[PDB]
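Appendix B. Extra example for self-study. Work through it before the problem class; the solution is given directly after the inputs so you can check yourself.
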Amino acid sequence: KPHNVLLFTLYPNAAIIAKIADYGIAQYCCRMGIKTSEGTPGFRAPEVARGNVIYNQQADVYSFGLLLYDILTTGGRIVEGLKFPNEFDELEIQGKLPDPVKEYGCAPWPMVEKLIKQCLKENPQERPTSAQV
Amino acid sequence: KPHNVLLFTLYPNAAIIAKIADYGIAQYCCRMGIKTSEGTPGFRAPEVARGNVIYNQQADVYSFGLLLYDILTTGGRIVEGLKFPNEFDELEIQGKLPDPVKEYGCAPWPMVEKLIKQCLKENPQERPTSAQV
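Solution. Structure tokens for the complete assembly:
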């Protein structure tokens, strides 16, 4: 989520800025996948939302994509999700999300809107791996 | 003065933070000294204040000392100098200045209070050179 990302400095030309915390539901996914479905609604992969699949580490890429969608449009959809958590979760699980530039009115960043269109596909095999992102 | 010093970033672990500007009265002091007395009252050396001496580059060290006195006690005396510019100039020219820790109430910094006691002496020959500071 945009809440487990910790900022250590706001100076752009630093060496360490962002860090990751809150490893409460981190598990082991070697080759066989995972059956338990956990994660905050609205930041879950489509496979994580449903409880009838065995998903792999690549379901964590979708969440990153959502994070990059919130980083891009300054957390625009998180504010609106407070009013409608049901629509929040439904759209996050489904994948029918608005174009980030069109609605929230941000300066175009065409080389990360491509990532946001890549690592949000409903098919986990098509999303880039974490080493490719 | 603490007005010709320009800040380019407030991140301590940078490479360039402070810079010097406003070279309006910068002159040439090879070996023979200078006779003209110029500079903002309250930031001048004792020799600069009087107009009957031939001072050298080391009269610019005193000003630096005053700057380090304002950097230390967060520009304490500059605020009080607005109410009494005459006392401001008189004390700056004379040299009878209060102990920075005692009056303005700052955390002790004993290795820069030594500079403020060194490069504010009434005898220009005793102050450290700019390469020693």
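Self-check: Strands of chain A lie at 5-7, 18-20. If your reasoning did not lead you there, revisit section 3.
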